[PDB]
Amino acid sequence: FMLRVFILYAENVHTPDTDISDAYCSAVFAGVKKRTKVIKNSVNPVWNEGFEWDLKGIPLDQGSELHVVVKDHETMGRNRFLGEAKVPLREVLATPSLSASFNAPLLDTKKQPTGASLVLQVSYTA
């Protein structure tokens, strides 16, 4: 019935041409974008935020993916894309616990690592 996601933190976050990182996380599922708050001045931002997607009747299948993007609010309306990951929700459907944790490297637009990583927890619950 719902996808529950806990965005805990990111590590080694570095914004190009800035001394300190001002990062927030953008998550999109079921056509719904949710955002964490911005953590000012941090290489290891701890958002510790819970998100709940009403799946509006759509169940997960094995192609389902949660898209997460970390961005700096050096820049606002424009992006300041720092890195992104696609987390495979098939792993959630893989054990009876209907939950999975991810420690996912963030990739650039060339889909190559940024050095930063994002830690999150995902749960499929009624």
Side-chain angles (χ1 to χ4, degrees):
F1 287 15
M2 293 169 93
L3 189 69
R4 177 177 56 211
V5 171
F6 299 98
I7 309 223
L8 303 192
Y9 61 91
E11 293 189 319
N12 279 248
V13 187
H14 295 290
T15 308
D17 297 295
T18 217
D19 71 322
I20 52 136
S21 350
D22 190 35
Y24 74 91
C25 183
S26 182
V28 173
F29 193 79
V32 183
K33 169 177 280 188
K34 301 177 187 288
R35 297 193 193 263
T36 69
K37 61 189 179 304
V38 182
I39 301 293
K40 318 298 296 186
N41 325 348
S42 188
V43 182
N44 167 58
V46 180
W47 300 284
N48 190 21
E49 271 184 62
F51 296 117
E52 294 199 333
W53 279 266
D54 172 24
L55 281 185
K56 316 271 184 189
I58 263 201
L60 311 184
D61 64 46
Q62 307 202 330
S64 288
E65 292 192 303
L66 174 71
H67 187 215
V68 296
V69 179
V70 184
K71 292 166 148 189
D72 193 307
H73 241 52
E74 195 59 278
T75 312
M76 303 197 84
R78 303 171 92 183
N79 58 44
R80 205 19 169 177
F81 173 98
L82 260 27
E84 67 177 345
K86 300 238 168 54
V87 323
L89 295 188
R90 71 174 66 94
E91 296 199 62
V92 174
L93 290 182
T95 90
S97 77
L98 295 178
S99 76
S101 72
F102 305 90
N103 201 331
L106 295 162
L107 315 185
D108 57 17
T109 38
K110 309 184 274 69
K111 296 292 181 177
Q112 290 164 203
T114 63
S117 56
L118 176 66
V119 171
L120 58 156
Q121 155 82 20
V122 189
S123 172
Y124 195 15
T125 196

Short mmCIF file of all heavy atoms in Angstrom, two decimals, residues 18-70:
data_model
loop_
_atom_site.label_atom_id
_atom_site.label_comp_id
_atom_site.label_asym_id
_atom_site.label_seq_id
_atom_site.Cartn_x
_atom_site.Cartn_y
_atom_site.Cartn_z
N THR A 18 33.32 25.24 -4.58
CA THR A 18 32.86 25.78 -3.32
C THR A 18 33.70 25.11 -2.23
O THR A 18 34.23 24.02 -2.43
CB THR A 18 31.36 25.49 -3.11
OG1 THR A 18 30.74 26.61 -2.47
CG2 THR A 18 31.18 24.26 -2.27
N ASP A 19 33.84 25.79 -1.09
CA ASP A 19 34.64 25.23 -0.01
C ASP A 19 33.83 24.25 0.84
O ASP A 19 34.34 23.21 1.24
CB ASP A 19 35.25 26.35 0.85
CG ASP A 19 34.23 27.09 1.69
OD1 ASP A 19 33.10 27.33 1.21
OD2 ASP A 19 34.57 27.45 2.84
N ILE A 20 32.56 24.58 1.09
CA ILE A 20 31.70 23.75 1.92
C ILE A 20 30.40 23.40 1.20
O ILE A 20 29.88 24.19 0.42
CB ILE A 20 31.36 24.43 3.24
CG1 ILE A 20 30.83 25.83 2.98
CG2 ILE A 20 32.61 24.51 4.09
CD1 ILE A 20 29.63 26.21 3.78
N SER A 21 29.88 22.21 1.49
CA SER A 21 28.71 21.72 0.77
C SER A 21 27.37 22.07 1.43
O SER A 21 27.22 21.96 2.65
CB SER A 21 28.82 20.21 0.56
OG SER A 21 30.11 19.74 0.92
N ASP A 22 26.42 22.47 0.61
CA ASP A 22 25.08 22.81 1.08
C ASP A 22 24.05 21.93 0.38
O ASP A 22 23.44 22.34 -0.61
CB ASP A 22 24.79 24.28 0.77
CG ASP A 22 23.53 24.76 1.42
OD1 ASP A 22 23.27 24.29 2.54
OD2 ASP A 22 22.81 25.58 0.83
N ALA A 23 23.84 20.73 0.92
CA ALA A 23 23.19 19.66 0.17
C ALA A 23 21.78 19.29 0.64
O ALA A 23 21.47 19.32 1.84
CB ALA A 23 24.08 18.41 0.15
N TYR A 24 20.94 18.92 -0.32
CA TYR A 24 19.64 18.34 -0.03
C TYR A 24 19.39 17.16 -0.97
O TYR A 24 20.06 17.01 -1.99
CB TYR A 24 18.53 19.38 -0.16
CG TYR A 24 18.18 19.77 -1.58
CD1 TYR A 24 17.20 19.09 -2.29
CD2 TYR A 24 18.82 20.83 -2.22
CE1 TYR A 24 16.87 19.43 -3.57
CE2 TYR A 24 18.50 21.18 -3.52
CZ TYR A 24 17.52 20.48 -4.19
OH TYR A 24 17.19 20.82 -5.49
N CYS A 25 18.52 16.36 -0.83
CA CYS A 25 18.27 15.15 -1.61
C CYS A 25 16.90 15.17 -2.29
O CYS A 25 15.89 15.45 -1.66
CB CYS A 25 18.38 13.92 -0.72
SG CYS A 25 18.18 12.35 -1.58
N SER A 26 16.78 14.88 -3.39
CA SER A 26 15.55 14.82 -4.17
C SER A 26 15.23 13.37 -4.50
O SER A 26 16.06 12.65 -5.04
CB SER A 26 15.68 15.63 -5.46
OG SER A 26 14.46 15.61 -6.18
N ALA A 27 14.02 12.94 -4.15
CA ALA A 27 13.59 11.57 -4.41
C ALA A 27 12.29 11.56 -5.20
O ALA A 27 11.34 12.27 -4.87
CB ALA A 27 13.43 10.81 -3.11
N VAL A 28 12.26 10.76 -6.26
CA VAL A 28 11.08 10.65 -7.11
C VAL A 28 10.59 9.22 -7.22
O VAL A 28 11.32 8.33 -7.66
CB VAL A 28 11.34 11.18 -8.53
CG1 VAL A 28 10.15 10.89 -9.43
CG2 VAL A 28 11.64 12.68 -8.49
N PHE A 29 9.35 8.99 -6.80
CA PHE A 29 8.70 7.72 -7.05
C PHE A 29 7.21 7.90 -7.33
O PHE A 29 6.59 8.83 -6.83
CB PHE A 29 8.90 6.74 -5.90
CG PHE A 29 8.51 5.33 -6.24
CD1 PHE A 29 9.36 4.53 -6.97
CD2 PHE A 29 7.28 4.82 -5.85
CE1 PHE A 29 9.01 3.23 -7.30
CE2 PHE A 29 6.93 3.53 -6.18
CZ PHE A 29 7.79 2.73 -6.90
N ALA A 30 6.66 6.99 -8.14
CA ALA A 30 5.26 7.02 -8.54
C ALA A 30 4.86 8.38 -9.09
O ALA A 30 3.74 8.85 -8.87
CB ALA A 30 4.36 6.62 -7.37
N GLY A 31 5.78 9.00 -9.81
CA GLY A 31 5.56 10.32 -10.36
C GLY A 31 5.46 11.41 -9.31
O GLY A 31 5.01 12.51 -9.61
N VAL A 32 5.88 11.11 -8.09
CA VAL A 32 5.85 12.11 -7.02
C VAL A 32 7.24 12.42 -6.47
O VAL A 32 7.93 11.55 -5.95
CB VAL A 32 4.91 11.69 -5.86
CG1 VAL A 32 4.85 12.80 -4.81
CG2 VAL A 32 3.52 11.37 -6.38
N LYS A 33 7.64 13.68 -6.61
CA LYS A 33 8.93 14.15 -6.11
C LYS A 33 8.82 14.68 -4.69
O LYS A 33 7.98 15.52 -4.39
CB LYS A 33 9.51 15.23 -7.03
CG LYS A 33 10.73 15.95 -6.45
CD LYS A 33 11.32 16.97 -7.42
CE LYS A 33 12.20 16.30 -8.46
NZ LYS A 33 12.93 17.29 -9.30
N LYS A 34 9.67 14.17 -3.80
CA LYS A 34 9.75 14.67 -2.44
C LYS A 34 11.18 15.14 -2.20
O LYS A 34 12.11 14.63 -2.81
CB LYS A 34 9.37 13.57 -1.44
CG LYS A 34 7.96 13.02 -1.63
CD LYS A 34 7.67 11.89 -0.66
CE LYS A 34 6.33 11.22 -0.95
NZ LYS A 34 5.17 12.07 -0.60
N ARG A 35 11.35 16.12 -1.31
CA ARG A 35 12.68 16.65 -1.03
C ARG A 35 12.95 16.71 0.46
O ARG A 35 12.06 17.02 1.26
CB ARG A 35 12.85 18.05 -1.62
CG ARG A 35 12.75 18.12 -3.14
CD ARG A 35 13.25 19.47 -3.65
NE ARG A 35 12.91 19.71 -5.05
CZ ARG A 35 13.73 19.51 -6.09
NH1 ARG A 35 14.96 19.05 -5.90
NH2 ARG A 35 13.31 19.77 -7.32
N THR A 36 14.19 16.43 0.84
CA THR A 36 14.62 16.65 2.21
C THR A 36 14.92 18.13 2.38
O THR A 36 14.94 18.88 1.41
CB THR A 36 15.91 15.87 2.55
OG1 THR A 36 17.01 16.44 1.82
CG2 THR A 36 15.78 14.38 2.20
N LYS A 37 15.15 18.55 3.62
CA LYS A 37 15.58 19.91 3.87
C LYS A 37 17.04 20.05 3.46
O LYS A 37 17.72 19.06 3.23
CB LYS A 37 15.39 20.27 5.34
CG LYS A 37 16.20 19.41 6.30
CD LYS A 37 15.79 19.68 7.74
CE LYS A 37 16.57 18.82 8.73
NZ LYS A 37 16.44 17.36 8.44
N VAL A 38 17.51 21.28 3.35
CA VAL A 38 18.91 21.52 3.07
C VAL A 38 19.71 21.48 4.37
O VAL A 38 19.27 22.00 5.39
CB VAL A 38 19.13 22.87 2.37
CG1 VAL A 38 20.58 23.07 2.06
CG2 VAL A 38 18.33 22.94 1.09
N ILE A 39 20.86 20.83 4.32
CA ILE A 39 21.80 20.86 5.44
C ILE A 39 22.92 21.82 5.09
O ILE A 39 23.77 21.52 4.25
CB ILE A 39 22.39 19.48 5.73
CG1 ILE A 39 21.29 18.47 6.07
CG2 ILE A 39 23.38 19.57 6.88
CD1 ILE A 39 20.57 18.77 7.37
N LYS A 40 22.93 22.99 5.73
CA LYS A 40 23.94 24.00 5.44
C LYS A 40 25.31 23.55 5.91
O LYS A 40 25.44 23.00 7.01
CB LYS A 40 23.58 25.35 6.07
CG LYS A 40 22.12 25.75 5.98
CD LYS A 40 21.64 25.92 4.54
CE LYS A 40 22.36 27.04 3.83
NZ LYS A 40 21.78 27.29 2.47
N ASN A 41 26.32 23.77 5.07
CA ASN A 41 27.72 23.64 5.48
C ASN A 41 28.08 22.27 6.06
O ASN A 41 28.32 22.14 7.26
CB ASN A 41 28.06 24.73 6.51
CG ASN A 41 27.32 26.03 6.23
OD1 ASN A 41 26.73 26.21 5.17
ND2 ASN A 41 27.36 26.95 7.19
N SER A 42 28.11 21.24 5.21
CA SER A 42 28.42 19.89 5.67
C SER A 42 28.88 18.94 4.56
O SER A 42 28.30 18.90 3.48
CB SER A 42 27.21 19.30 6.40
OG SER A 42 27.54 18.06 7.01
N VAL A 43 29.92 18.17 4.86
CA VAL A 43 30.45 17.18 3.93
C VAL A 43 29.71 15.86 4.16
O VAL A 43 29.69 14.98 3.30
CB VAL A 43 31.97 17.00 4.14
CG1 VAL A 43 32.55 15.99 3.16
CG2 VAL A 43 32.68 18.34 4.02
N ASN A 44 28.99 15.74 5.27
CA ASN A 44 28.31 14.51 5.70
C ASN A 44 26.90 14.79 6.21
O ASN A 44 26.64 14.75 7.35
CB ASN A 44 29.13 13.71 6.72
CG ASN A 44 28.32 12.61 7.44
OD1 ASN A 44 27.76 11.71 6.83
ND2 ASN A 44 28.28 12.68 8.75
N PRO A 45 26.09 15.37 5.36
CA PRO A 45 24.78 15.86 5.78
C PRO A 45 23.90 14.73 6.29
O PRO A 45 23.76 13.70 5.63
CB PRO A 45 24.19 16.43 4.48
CG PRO A 45 24.86 15.65 3.41
CD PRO A 45 26.25 15.40 3.90
N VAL A 46 23.33 14.91 7.48
CA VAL A 46 22.41 13.94 8.04
C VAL A 46 21.01 14.52 7.97
O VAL A 46 20.64 15.37 8.78
CB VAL A 46 22.76 13.63 9.51
CG1 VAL A 46 21.79 12.61 10.08
CG2 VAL A 46 24.20 13.13 9.61
N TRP A 47 20.23 14.07 7.00
CA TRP A 47 18.86 14.54 6.85
C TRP A 47 17.93 13.79 7.80
O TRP A 47 17.07 14.41 8.45
CB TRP A 47 18.38 14.38 5.41
CG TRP A 47 19.20 15.15 4.42
CD1 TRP A 47 19.16 16.50 4.21
CD2 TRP A 47 20.19 14.63 3.52
NE1 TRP A 47 20.06 16.85 3.23
CE2 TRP A 47 20.70 15.72 2.79
CE3 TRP A 47 20.68 13.35 3.26
CZ2 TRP A 47 21.68 15.57 1.81
CZ3 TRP A 47 21.66 13.20 2.29
CH2 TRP A 47 22.15 14.30 1.57
N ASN A 48 18.11 12.48 7.89
CA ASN A 48 17.28 11.62 8.74
C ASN A 48 15.79 11.88 8.53
O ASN A 48 15.05 12.15 9.48
CB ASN A 48 17.67 11.82 10.21
CG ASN A 48 17.02 10.80 11.13
OD1 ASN A 48 16.61 9.73 10.69
ND2 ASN A 48 16.93 11.13 12.41
N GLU A 49 15.36 11.83 7.28
CA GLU A 49 13.98 12.15 6.95
C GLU A 49 13.19 10.96 6.43
O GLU A 49 13.71 10.15 5.66
CB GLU A 49 13.92 13.31 5.96
CG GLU A 49 13.87 14.68 6.62
CD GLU A 49 13.70 15.80 5.63
OE1 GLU A 49 12.66 15.83 4.94
OE2 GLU A 49 14.61 16.65 5.55
N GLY A 50 11.95 10.87 6.87
CA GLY A 50 11.05 9.82 6.43
C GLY A 50 10.10 10.32 5.37
O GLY A 50 9.56 11.42 5.47
N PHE A 51 9.91 9.52 4.33
CA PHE A 51 8.98 9.84 3.26
C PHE A 51 8.03 8.68 3.05
O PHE A 51 8.43 7.52 3.18
CB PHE A 51 9.72 10.14 1.96
CG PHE A 51 10.61 11.35 2.03
CD1 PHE A 51 11.98 11.23 1.86
CD2 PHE A 51 10.07 12.61 2.23
CE1 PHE A 51 12.80 12.34 1.92
CE2 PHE A 51 10.89 13.73 2.29
CZ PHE A 51 12.25 13.59 2.13
N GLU A 52 6.78 8.98 2.74
CA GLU A 52 5.79 7.95 2.45
C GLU A 52 5.10 8.24 1.13
O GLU A 52 4.48 9.29 0.96
CB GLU A 52 4.76 7.86 3.58
CG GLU A 52 5.32 7.38 4.90
CD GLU A 52 4.24 6.87 5.84
OE1 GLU A 52 3.08 7.33 5.73
OE2 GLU A 52 4.55 6.00 6.68
N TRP A 53 5.21 7.30 0.19
CA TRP A 53 4.48 7.39 -1.06
C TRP A 53 3.24 6.52 -0.99
O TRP A 53 3.33 5.30 -0.86
CB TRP A 53 5.34 6.91 -2.23
CG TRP A 53 6.31 7.92 -2.76
CD1 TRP A 53 6.11 8.79 -3.80
CD2 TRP A 53 7.64 8.15 -2.29
NE1 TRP A 53 7.24 9.55 -4.00
CE2 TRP A 53 8.19 9.18 -3.08
CE3 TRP A 53 8.42 7.60 -1.27
CZ2 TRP A 53 9.48 9.66 -2.89
CZ3 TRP A 53 9.70 8.08 -1.08
CH2 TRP A 53 10.22 9.10 -1.88
N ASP A 54 2.07 7.15 -1.07
CA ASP A 54 0.87 6.39 -1.39
C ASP A 54 1.10 5.91 -2.81
O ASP A 54 1.40 6.71 -3.70
CB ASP A 54 -0.39 7.24 -1.32
CG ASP A 54 -1.62 6.51 -1.84
OD1 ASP A 54 -1.62 5.26 -1.84
OD2 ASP A 54 -2.58 7.18 -2.25
N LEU A 55 0.97 4.61 -3.01
CA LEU A 55 1.27 4.01 -4.30
C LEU A 55 0.09 4.13 -5.26
O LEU A 55 0.15 3.64 -6.39
CB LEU A 55 1.67 2.56 -4.10
CG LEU A 55 3.12 2.42 -3.64
CD1 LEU A 55 3.55 0.97 -3.56
CD2 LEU A 55 4.01 3.21 -4.58
N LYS A 56 -0.96 4.81 -4.79
CA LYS A 56 -2.21 4.99 -5.52
C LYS A 56 -2.64 3.75 -6.29
O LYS A 56 -2.94 3.82 -7.48
CB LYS A 56 -2.12 6.18 -6.48
CG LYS A 56 -1.46 7.41 -5.89
CD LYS A 56 -2.46 8.32 -5.20
CE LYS A 56 -1.77 9.58 -4.71
NZ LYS A 56 -2.65 10.42 -3.86
N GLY A 57 -2.64 2.61 -5.61
CA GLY A 57 -3.07 1.38 -6.23
C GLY A 57 -2.01 0.65 -7.02
O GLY A 57 -2.14 -0.54 -7.27
N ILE A 58 -0.96 1.35 -7.45
CA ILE A 58 0.13 0.69 -8.16
C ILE A 58 1.04 -0.08 -7.20
O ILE A 58 1.57 0.48 -6.24
CB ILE A 58 0.98 1.66 -9.03
CG1 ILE A 58 0.50 1.63 -10.48
CG2 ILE A 58 2.45 1.29 -9.01
CD1 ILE A 58 1.52 2.13 -11.51
N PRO A 59 1.18 -1.40 -7.43
CA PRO A 59 2.13 -2.19 -6.64
C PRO A 59 3.51 -2.14 -7.29
O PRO A 59 3.61 -1.82 -8.48
CB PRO A 59 1.56 -3.60 -6.74
CG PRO A 59 0.87 -3.63 -8.06
CD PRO A 59 0.37 -2.23 -8.33
N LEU A 60 4.54 -2.43 -6.52
CA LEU A 60 5.89 -2.50 -7.05
C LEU A 60 6.00 -3.75 -7.91
O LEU A 60 5.35 -4.76 -7.64
CB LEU A 60 6.91 -2.61 -5.91
CG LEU A 60 6.88 -1.66 -4.71
CD1 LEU A 60 8.08 -1.95 -3.81
CD2 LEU A 60 6.87 -0.20 -5.13
N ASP A 61 6.82 -3.68 -8.95
CA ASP A 61 7.29 -4.91 -9.59
C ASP A 61 8.82 -4.88 -9.63
O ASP A 61 9.44 -4.02 -9.00
CB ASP A 61 6.66 -5.16 -10.97
CG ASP A 61 7.01 -4.09 -12.00
OD1 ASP A 61 8.19 -3.71 -12.12
OD2 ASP A 61 6.09 -3.66 -12.72
N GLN A 62 9.41 -5.80 -10.38
CA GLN A 62 10.87 -5.95 -10.34
C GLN A 62 11.63 -4.94 -11.20
O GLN A 62 12.86 -4.96 -11.24
CB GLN A 62 11.26 -7.39 -10.68
CG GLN A 62 10.53 -8.43 -9.83
CD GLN A 62 11.26 -9.76 -9.77
OE1 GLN A 62 11.97 -10.15 -10.70
NE2 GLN A 62 11.10 -10.47 -8.66
N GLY A 63 10.90 -4.05 -11.87
CA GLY A 63 11.52 -3.02 -12.68
C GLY A 63 11.48 -1.68 -11.97
O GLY A 63 12.13 -0.72 -12.38
N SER A 64 10.70 -1.63 -10.89
CA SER A 64 10.52 -0.42 -10.10
C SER A 64 11.85 0.10 -9.58
O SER A 64 12.70 -0.67 -9.13
CB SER A 64 9.59 -0.70 -8.92
OG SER A 64 8.25 -0.86 -9.35
N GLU A 65 12.03 1.41 -9.67
CA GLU A 65 13.25 2.04 -9.16
C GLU A 65 12.93 3.37 -8.48
O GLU A 65 12.07 4.13 -8.93
CB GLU A 65 14.28 2.24 -10.27
CG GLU A 65 14.87 0.94 -10.82
CD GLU A 65 16.08 1.16 -11.71
OE1 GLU A 65 15.97 1.89 -12.72
OE2 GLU A 65 17.16 0.59 -11.40
N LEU A 66 13.62 3.63 -7.37
CA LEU A 66 13.54 4.91 -6.69
C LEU A 66 14.71 5.75 -7.15
O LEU A 66 15.87 5.34 -7.04
CB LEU A 66 13.59 4.70 -5.18
CG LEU A 66 13.67 5.92 -4.26
CD1 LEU A 66 12.35 6.67 -4.24
CD2 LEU A 66 14.06 5.49 -2.86
N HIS A 67 14.43 6.93 -7.69
CA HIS A 67 15.48 7.80 -8.20
C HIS A 67 15.82 8.88 -7.18
O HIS A 67 14.96 9.65 -6.76
CB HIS A 67 15.06 8.45 -9.53
CG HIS A 67 16.15 9.22 -10.20
ND1 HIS A 67 15.93 10.38 -10.91
CD2 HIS A 67 17.49 8.99 -10.27
CE1 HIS A 67 17.07 10.83 -11.38
NE2 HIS A 67 18.04 10.01 -11.01
N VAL A 68 17.08 8.92 -6.78
CA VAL A 68 17.51 9.89 -5.79
C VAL A 68 18.61 10.78 -6.36
O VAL A 68 19.55 10.29 -7.00
CB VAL A 68 17.97 9.21 -4.48
CG1 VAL A 68 16.79 8.49 -3.83
CG2 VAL A 68 19.11 8.23 -4.75
N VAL A 69 18.47 12.08 -6.16
CA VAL A 69 19.45 13.05 -6.63
C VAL A 69 19.87 13.95 -5.48
O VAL A 69 19.03 14.51 -4.78
CB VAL A 69 18.87 13.94 -7.76
CG1 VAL A 69 19.91 14.96 -8.22
CG2 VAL A 69 18.40 13.09 -8.93
N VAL A 70 21.18 14.07 -5.29
CA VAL A 70 21.70 15.01 -4.31
C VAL A 70 22.16 16.27 -5.03
O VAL A 70 22.82 16.20 -6.06
CB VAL A 70 22.86 14.39 -3.50
CG1 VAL A 70 23.32 15.35 -2.42
CG2 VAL A 70 22.41 13.08 -2.87
#
